[PDB]
Each structure stands twice: as C-alpha cells, then as structure tokens.
Design a binder for this molecule. Structure first.
Ligand SMILES: Nc1nc2c(ncn2[C@@H]2O[C@H](COP(=O)(O)OP(=O)(O)O)[C@@H](O)[C@H]2O)c(=O)[nH]1
Ligand SMILES: O=S(=O)(Nc1nc2c(O)ccc(Cl)c2s1)c1ccc(O)cc1
Ligand SMILES: [Mg+2]
Length: 170
C-alpha cells in the first residue's frame, strides 16, 4: 500500500532547489551547495492518509538544449518551479521553465507548484501579490518557503503531490 510520485525541482541557479530538497530529506540547511550536482532523493511520507513514495530530482543545469532535461521532464510527474523572492530575474525565468515543460508534455495539464523561496530574507523584490497573480494565471498553487527556517518546505512538496493525485483523476 504505497503510491509513487516523481517530482522535479526546477528554477534558476541559486534560488534554493538543493537547499529545499536537502531540507525536506535530511532536515538541515546547506549554506553552499555545488550548483552542478544533480541527484535524486526518495522518501516515504503520509499525505492525506496515503503512504507516498516521493522520488525527487534536484536539477542542476537549466539549459534549453539538453537531452537529459528533456528526458527528466518526460519522466517527471510534477514540477516545483522555484524562484527567490529577492531575485526578480528568477521570477521572470519561471515563464520559460513552464513553457519548456508544457512543450515536452504536449499538454496544459501539468502538475506544478510555484514556490517563492528565501522568504526569510527581508529585502523582497517580488511582491507576493504579483506571484499570486502569476500563479492564478497558470491555475497553480503558490507557496512561499524558507529552506533556511524550513517554513512551508514539506507543504510545498506535499502540495505538489496533491496536484498530481488530482490530475490523475482527470
Ligand atoms: N536565506 C536563505 N538562503 C537560501 C535559501 N535557500 C537557499 N539559500 C541559499 O542560496 C544559495 C543557493 O542555494 P542552492 O540550494 O544551492 O540553489 P540551487 O542552485 O537552486 O540549487 C545558497 O547559499 C543557499 O544557502 C533560503 O530559503 N533562505
Ligand atoms: O532520467 S534519469 O536517468 N533518472 C531519473 N531519475 C529520476 C528520479 O529519481 C526522480 C524523478 C525523475 Cl523525473 C527522475 S529522471 C536521470 C536524470 C538526471 C540525471 O542527472 C541522471 C539521470
Ligand atoms: Mg543545486
């Protein structure tokens, strides 16, 4: 009695993809994690009464032209699209990652959660209302997280599981 969920964490370099993933799996915050390391992590959790096996790919390179990226986007069932709340460019990059994924899936039905990470940093450049508006325009949830303090880290990933589970019924 288990259900598998293949999750992929994407976003511009430095937004906290690794820090989020390592906080979820290993309960620590990494100060400086090599940006080229691309690994997957598996963990079993209970979400809404279901024992879930999360298989999470923490992506490194975000290149448009990458056979490996095409392959993991085909494999991945849901996508955590991460920007940093103190980096406007990373928020603008989100549109491109969504377009890449939609292209690979040939579909509009893609389970995705918009994550504004680094919520513990006081000098915000991305207004929460703008991020909420973007998420509304895509029809996806929006969550602000802090990999540093663990704020909403499990919530971001579990929310993505819920999105996948629902899309499976549609
Ligand atoms: N203050 C703060 N720093 C963070 C947070 N998440 C990541 N960082 C830092 O931002 C930098 C990049 O994080 P990393 O996880 O390596 O980014 P990635 O390239 O997206 O994997 C590192 O110095 C992290 O310690 C966060 O929620 N808050
Ligand atoms: O496509 S893979 O051969 N394996 C994958 N593993 C996982 C995985 O463990 C979770 C989610 C996804 Cl989408 C994938 S894709 C691969 C993906 C990226 C690599 O750097 C190396 C291998
Ligand atoms: Mg990383």
């Amino acid at each position: 009695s288990m259900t598998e969920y293949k999750l992929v964490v994407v976003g511009a370099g430095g937004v906290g993809k690794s820090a989020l993933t390592i906080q979820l799996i290993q309960n620590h915050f990494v100060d400086e994690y090599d940006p080229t390391i691309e690994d997957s992590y598996r963990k079993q959790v209970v979400i809404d009464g279901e024992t879930c096996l999360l298989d999470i790919l923490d992506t490194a390179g975000q290149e448009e032209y990458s056979a490996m990226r095409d392959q993991y986007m085909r494999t991945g069932e849901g996508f955590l699209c991460v920007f940093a709340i103190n980096n406007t460019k990373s928020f603008e990059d989100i549109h491109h990652y969504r377009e890449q994924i939609k292209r690979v899936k040939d579909s509009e039905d893609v389970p995705m959660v918009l994550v504004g990470n680094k919520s513990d940093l006081p000098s915000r450049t991305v207004d929460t209302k703008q991020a909420q508006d973007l998420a509304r325009s895509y029809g996806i949830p929006f969550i602000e997280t802090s990999a540093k303090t663990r704020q909403r880290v499990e919530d971001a990933f579990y929310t993505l599981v819920r999105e996948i589970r629902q899309y499976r019924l549609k």
